[PDB]
Design a binder for this molecule. Sequence first.
Ligand SMILES: Nc1ncnc2c1ncn2[C@@H]1O[C@H](COP(=O)(O)OP(=O)(O)OP(=O)(O)O)[C@@H](O)[C@H]1O
Ligand SMILES: [Mg+2]
Lengths: 232, 237, 237, 48, 382, 128, 255
Amino acid sequence: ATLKEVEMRLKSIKNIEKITKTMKIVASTRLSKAEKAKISAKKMDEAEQLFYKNAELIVAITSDKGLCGSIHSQLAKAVRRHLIVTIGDKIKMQLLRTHPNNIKLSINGIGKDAPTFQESALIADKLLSVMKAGTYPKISIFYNDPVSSLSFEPSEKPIFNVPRDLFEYTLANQMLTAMAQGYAAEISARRNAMDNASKNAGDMINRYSILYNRTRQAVITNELVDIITGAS
Amino acid sequence: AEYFRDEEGQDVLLFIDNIFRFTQAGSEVSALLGRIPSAVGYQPTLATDMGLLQERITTTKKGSVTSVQAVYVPADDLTDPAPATTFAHLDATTVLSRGISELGIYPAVDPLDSKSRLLDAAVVGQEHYDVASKVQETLQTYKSLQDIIAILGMDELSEQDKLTVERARKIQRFLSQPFAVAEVFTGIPGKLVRLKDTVASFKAVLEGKYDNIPEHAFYMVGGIEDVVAKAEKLAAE
Amino acid sequence: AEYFRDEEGQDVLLFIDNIFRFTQAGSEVSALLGRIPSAVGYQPTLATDMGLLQERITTTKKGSVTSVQAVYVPADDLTDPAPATTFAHLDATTVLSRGISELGIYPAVDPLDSKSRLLDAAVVGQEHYDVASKVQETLQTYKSLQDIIAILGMDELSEQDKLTVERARKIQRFLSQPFAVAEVFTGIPGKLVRLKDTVASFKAVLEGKYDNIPEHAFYMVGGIEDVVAKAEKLAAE
Amino acid sequence: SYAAYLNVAAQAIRSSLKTELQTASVLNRSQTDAFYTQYASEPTPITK
Amino acid sequence: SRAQVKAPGILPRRSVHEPVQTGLKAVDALVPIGRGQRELIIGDRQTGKTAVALDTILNQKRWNNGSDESKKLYCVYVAVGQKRSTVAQLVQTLEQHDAMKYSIIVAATASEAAPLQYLAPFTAASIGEWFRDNGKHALIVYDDLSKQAVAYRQLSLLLRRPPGREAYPGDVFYLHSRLLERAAKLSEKEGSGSLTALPVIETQGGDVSAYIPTNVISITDGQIFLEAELFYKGIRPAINVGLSVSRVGSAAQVKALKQVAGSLKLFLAQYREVAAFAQFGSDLDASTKQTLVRGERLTQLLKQNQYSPLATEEQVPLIYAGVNGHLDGIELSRIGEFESSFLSYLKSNHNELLTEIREKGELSKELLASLKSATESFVATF
Amino acid sequence: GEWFRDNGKHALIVYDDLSKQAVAYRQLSLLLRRPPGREAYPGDVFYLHSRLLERAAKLSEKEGSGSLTALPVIETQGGDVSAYIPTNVISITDGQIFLEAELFYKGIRPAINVGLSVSRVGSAAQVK
Amino acid sequence: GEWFRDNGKHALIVYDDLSKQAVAYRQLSLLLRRPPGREAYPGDVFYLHSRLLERAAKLSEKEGSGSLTALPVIETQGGDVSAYIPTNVISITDGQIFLEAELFYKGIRPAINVGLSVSRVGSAAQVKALKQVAGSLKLFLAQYREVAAFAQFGSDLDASTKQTLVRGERLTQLLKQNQYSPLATEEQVPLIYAGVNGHLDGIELSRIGEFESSFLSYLKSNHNELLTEIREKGELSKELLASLKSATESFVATF
Ligand SMILES: Nc1ncnc2c1ncn2[C@@H]1O[C@H](COP(=O)(O)OP(=O)(O)OP(=O)(O)O)[C@@H](O)[C@H]1O
Ligand SMILES: [Mg+2]
């Protein structure tokens, strides 16, 4: 109502806009690495996939950090539509609210940087040790794919002494291949999300910039009405 | 009205539209009467010139007067001396606001700024009181999250809060109601909704029975049965 | 105060509590005398009245009348003419903030909003200015990271900023002091510290010499030579 | 275990690289920070 | 007695050291009011102010029926600018609760000439000053001083005196000041009496920068700030614990309630700090999540119904169970079921704890440990 | 217009625009030392407009069936309808046609905001 | 000062500060009961400050070519320039030097906001030696003022921005200096040169003060001819820039 209130509101909004601009920029910088990673990993994946092409549980991957738009929403929804091991806290919570008894294993802290075969292999090892995953009649990997520079789509991918070592290795291969594509997708959706956020902040600033000027004119007029009536 | 109250002893209802004009007419004349003007430009006698009229509009041991007063708010400024002084003289106050009208939600009552002395469990019942408290809580939770929704979006919100926002958008829209005198310029025929039906409906909405019906089913309908009827009609489209 | 200066030949100090009401009363007396009110309602003579009061508070060859003035800031608005005019004359500030007692350190003086004109190398010396500047840098670095410490935790911080926050907490606590008058209610014995024993004591903390010691050893200790002893006595318990 | 076998064999092929060649990437490949917790009951967090 | 008698001076007073027990958790435990104090109940329209003053009036029933004249507190209510029907309803409430026998109502209603609205507070003060000067205790509630200011403005402007800020006269501060600090706590030399003032103020648009609020906030020893965003959230009474403050503080507080209000205030300060991140509770750090949990549970704990004041024997166990973490396992919606079902338990199976908290006034260790035991023996079944 | 009205004929009156009549009345008043109210306008601006616009009336066959139709125009600073004079004329009048600049620049001309626009007599006049 | 202006001499006038003059005039007029205006100020406060300030002038040869230079001071509450008297003076003057508290309590001294400060006249008056070397300092600082928000993130930043972040830090640490130590142009141009040409990048940001104080002594002790020429000529020849590059690099290497 008063000037000290509109100005503080405007300052808070400008702070939100700056905080979102820096986030957009850092998400733009962190992308090149993720895209290099996605391309290299998919180039590896093509080789191992070619064999199945010629011949013949769920892991759900998201990061723990939010403010990435619909990355976790669409994937939790796709997993429920298909209906579990959760990589990341946010898919963990989405699944835990709906079906708390189904979660068997959770991994967190991975997404802070581009994935690597160390994390994937160690996850595969704890998986085959605690769950003995290789015994399950079926295994499926749920992850997000960056179909474009401004959108993504969720996706499910199967996992079907050469056979033992081959499956045990392709498990780590596909977990890495999914983690990479999910990391790229979340960075892109954290660059478009903060773009929309900053533009909405701009629209809010353009509204409060009218509210402020109105309050300014009103304050001056009324202070001067008081002074004049005192001086009459 | 006072003769009907006292001399005839009958029950009386007094409609005054608009009582702000009394204070405004006093303001217009105050400057020519030779008085130093008070605040934003009203007369000194506002609070007492108002009281001398307002305190006559009251129920007495001799008779009852039920008073409905329209109070204009200039420049939408509820803080203007006249409304600010009138608020103290009324047992019930419904504040119509412009925002709720731009949203299309007639009769445009601000569900929160509107207040009544009788909204206590000793009078309306505990069910009714708790329903009204849950409605207010849902709507205020919705209004506290508006900045987040504007900038960030609804994705960030928690699971309870997404539900509370969907339910707030349903509730605020269900408080809309078409009036039989407004049909000429709104087209929608009128609806009268009983108190018990209203409480039961908002209870059923708060208790989650109708999370499966879209927001549009609640707009400008009457009771919950009409929400279901319109949901079926929209589905058939 | 001026008599004890000019006719007792000694340095005295004058407490005025509260200086806001000097200007408030000046505004009352001006309005009553029929002088046109200025800005938000103060007397036109505001600056000159404050001057004719303050400019007697000064050093002369016979002595100095020092003043410690409580300043009531209405509505927390440092831009109100009363505090705005007072600030032009005073050159040291001491902000006692609730935001520091809420976390339980007394005197409760804000190390960052509180400031002084005399914090200049030509007055306090470079050894003191360096220490003060690095204190106001560590505390401000901590006050920058609080959002990060909350949403994230202290593990995400770099090993540099983790050390900065540790030393900032130690400094925040070491600025606390038991008064020689609090001996009755708090029970704590109370002590006073010289400027050397303080500047050097903080230099030793910034230089990381006592980074081995926990934060609690700094809480109510007048000087590091007693922080060592408190650490020993706590570890022995 | 075969994937972890490849992981330890990779570490063997990796630490044996000249100390000038171990670019930041090579160190990064060796600093997995992940934690795991089996599950609504679950024990304390365990490092990988 | 004259209306504008002079207030007592420095020398005859004694410091505030005894409590004006409101029976409201949010006040007695966070912004205590003492006998001899001046506490401004400030807030926007329809926010809960009269409810606070009236619960304070109604809670004195447990002492005023007593024979010990040192504990009973008589009441005076000054209705300035109110309509007569509101006073009719207030007298109905006080009659129902049997509080009239210790209450005087002074009514300069809206239709009353402006001079009488200006003058009523001074005469009500002079009525209370009799109890003060005869060794008795009084609580004077002004509802409300903004309307006395409006009446004084009317009088002044029609007398052709020059206006100041916001069209008010120059000397409104001198109007309210020589009203409020007639409240005092007198020393044994002058009869040990007390007069306690609870002035109400109505803030338009929440603006405390207005002239009369800016004045009265400067005259009073503390403020209970009532805010509507808290009201609609079910925090009732809607006391903003962060804006509200007492300058008398611990001295005015019951000792047992002090021993826990310290920690209560610290934890609610931590909550006020983190609260900006309240909604996104999941992704925060452990300590921030814990602080959010405990602070939200305590804020819910402080709510209580209208015309249902509590004894301090009933406040201490509840603030203890909240501070000391027991309530962290209880869902935020069940806290209302808790404070109801716990006290009923304590009264039934652990009466001596309440009896000793009341009689002795201080939580002894032998008793604090048994209270811990008796709270564990409940949260387990709950 | 009231001549056509009072002699059985139909008239329409466009005022372009009342904001400037209000400004002129503010001038005339303040120069007469008439104390300023809200937005520095005199207290009797509502009476300036109400006795102007109430003359627009549809008469009975007892008088002769005339009518005077008033289309007052108002300029809004910054697009705000919450101002004093706009709100006053909205209170006097039987409807409003709000023309929004965002739509005008978009190429929606006439820029009728069908939401804020309303004719409280509505369908009664509309052609069947 | 007008005596000096009119007698062919050069005068500088520092008004500290004109806000209090406006307050004095408000008091003076309100006690005289003259009708007030905005902010309780009289109508013609603009005609007070203009009538004061624009007596400053540079005169033609017909009048002795004297001058009078005005540095008015205005105390802005909360840094708001929307106020009445600050607006008026900002409109009267040929520029502004904006000092910001946000930079002051972060240890920058003088706390000149390069983004808001502007001289609409002096760029023609500036010393050529300084112009040649500092032309790009505006751009480097304007880029640093953007990147400053992204700085705290770390390695994530591109090299084309890391270079900016490296330069602007040294530049801001260069432009700060202790009070009552005003430096000669001959000592200023070499430092801005070392900075704009990135020679300081190999020095820890904490030691720039040690660098400057040392550098001055070297040029003064081993390259005085160049300082002498800089101030005798005021402009850098093709050859002086080369000798300055040589001295700067030979120092930075052995610093
Ligand atoms: N603790 C509470 N719990 C539930 N309802 C409450 C509580 N306190 C107040 N209310 C409700 O708030 C409403 C306002 O009460 P109150 O008379 O205290 O307001 P007020 O501050 O006097 O406002 P005004 O005097 O301007 O009407 C009442 O209808 C009452 O039922
Ligand atoms: Mg009330």
